[PDB]
Design a protein around this motif. Structure first.
Motif, PDB file in Angstrom:
ATOM      1  N   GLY A   1      -2.437  -0.153   8.528  1.00  0.00           N
ATOM      2  CA  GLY A   1      -1.654  -0.109   7.308  1.00  0.00           C
ATOM      3  C   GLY A   1      -1.367  -1.525   6.943  1.00  0.00           C
ATOM      4  O   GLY A   1      -0.302  -2.030   7.250  1.00  0.00           O
TER       5      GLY A   1
ATOM      6  N   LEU B   1      -5.033   5.380  -0.899  1.00  0.00           N
ATOM      7  CA  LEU B   1      -6.415   5.335  -0.386  1.00  0.00           C
ATOM      8  C   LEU B   1      -7.096   6.685  -0.455  1.00  0.00           C
ATOM      9  O   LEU B   1      -8.280   6.777  -0.832  1.00  0.00           O
TER      10      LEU B   1
ATOM     11  N   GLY C   1      -5.418  -0.729   4.763  1.00  0.00           N
ATOM     12  CA  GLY C   1      -4.632  -0.657   3.545  1.00  0.00           C
ATOM     13  C   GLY C   1      -4.322  -2.063   3.164  1.00  0.00           C
ATOM     14  O   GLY C   1      -3.251  -2.556   3.466  1.00  0.00           O
TER      15      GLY C   1
ATOM     16  N   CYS D   1       0.812  -1.207   0.000  1.00  0.00           N
ATOM     17  CA  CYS D   1       0.000   0.000   0.000  1.00  0.00           C
ATOM     18  C   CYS D   1       0.850   1.265   0.000  1.00  0.00           C
ATOM     19  O   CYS D   1       1.466   1.617   1.030  1.00  0.00           O
TER      20      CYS D   1
ATOM     21  N   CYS E   1       3.725  -0.763   3.798  1.00  0.00           N
ATOM     22  CA  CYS E   1       2.933   0.457   3.787  1.00  0.00           C
ATOM     23  C   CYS E   1       3.804   1.708   3.769  1.00  0.00           C
ATOM     24  O   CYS E   1       4.430   2.062   4.793  1.00  0.00           O
TER      25      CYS E   1
ATOM     26  N   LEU F   1      -1.969   5.875   2.786  1.00  0.00           N
ATOM     27  CA  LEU F   1      -3.350   5.860   3.303  1.00  0.00           C
ATOM     28  C   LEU F   1      -4.009   7.219   3.218  1.00  0.00           C
ATOM     29  O   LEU F   1      -5.194   7.325   2.843  1.00  0.00           O
TER      30      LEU F   1
END
Lengths: 77, 77, 77, 77, 77, 77
Positions: A62, B22, B62, A19, C19, A22
């Motif tokens: 996360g 996101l 995430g 990811c 992340c 966020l």
């Protein structure tokens, strides 16, 4: 009578989450009222109960990856 | 009487989520009322109950990947 | 009567979360009222209960990965 | 006069090479002659030069992947 | 006059090379002659030069992956 | 006049090389001659030069991965 059991599950599994970001997240819940009126409460024999709540949550992982396994082997006689 | 069992599940499975971003997310729930009026409450024998709630949630993972496995082997006599 | 059991689960599983960032996150829950009025409370035999709460939470893990395993083997006679 | 710049390139790119084997490789360059005859050499002001070479190379990478990035941001006044 | 700059490049990039084997590699360059005859050499002002070479190389990396990045930010006044 | 700069590059990059084996590698360069005849050599002002070489190399890295980064930020007035 002979019983032979072999239990070899071979697991090579990967749960992943890449990811980049966020970012901003806003939670603005409006105020509320939760009025409860009950005369009696006779709870017994494993009773789990909630009587009056206002739950505000911000769960931001996360990567919230969840892996659940369960192995079970039962033998009788 | 001979019983021979072999249990070799071979799992090479990948659950994945590639997520660039996101970004902004806004939760603005309006305020509410949850009035409950009950005279009696005779709970028993594994009773699970909720009586009066206002649940506001913002669950933002995430990558919320969830893998659930269950292996089970039962033998009788 | 001879019983031979072998239990060799081989697990090479990786739960991961890469992340880049989490960033700003704002939680602004509005104030509320949770009035409860109950005359009696006869709790017994493993009763778990909550009577009046206002729960505000901000659970932010930089990777909230949760792996749960359970191995179980039961033998009778 | 207000200038606001945001620079968020998010890159999740993978350069990969899976190679089972490379195996035998034979380089047999024949011998050569490189005769140069020059009377004068007046080199100046950042001059880079080569005068007489015989270059034999065997560049064998097990994966020669090359990733080149360049980020540039220029602001005036 | 107010200038606000934000510089957040987020890079999650993987350069990889999986290589089972490299194996035999033979380099047999034939012998050569590199005769150079120059009367004068007036080098100046950052001059880089080579005058007479025979370069034999065997560059064998088990994965020769090369990642090059360059970030640059220039502000004037 | 107010200038605000933020410089947050976030890099999570992996350069890798998995290599099962390298194995036999033979370098047999033939003998050579590099005769140079120069009357004068007036080198000055940062001159770097090589005059007469025979370079035999065997550069074998078990993973020769090279990562090069460069961050640069210049502010004027």
């Amino acid at each position: 009578g002979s019983v032979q059991i072999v239990y070899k599950p071979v697991d090579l599994s990967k749960v992943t989450s890449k990811c980049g970001s966020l970012g901003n997240i806003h939670h603005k819940p409006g105020g509320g009222q939760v009025e409860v009126k009950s005369e009696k409460l006779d709870f017994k024999d494993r009773v789990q109960s909630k009587i009056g709540s206002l739950d505000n949550i911000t769960h931001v992982p996360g990567g919230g990856n969840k892996k659940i396994e369960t192995h079970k082997l039962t033998f009788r006689e």
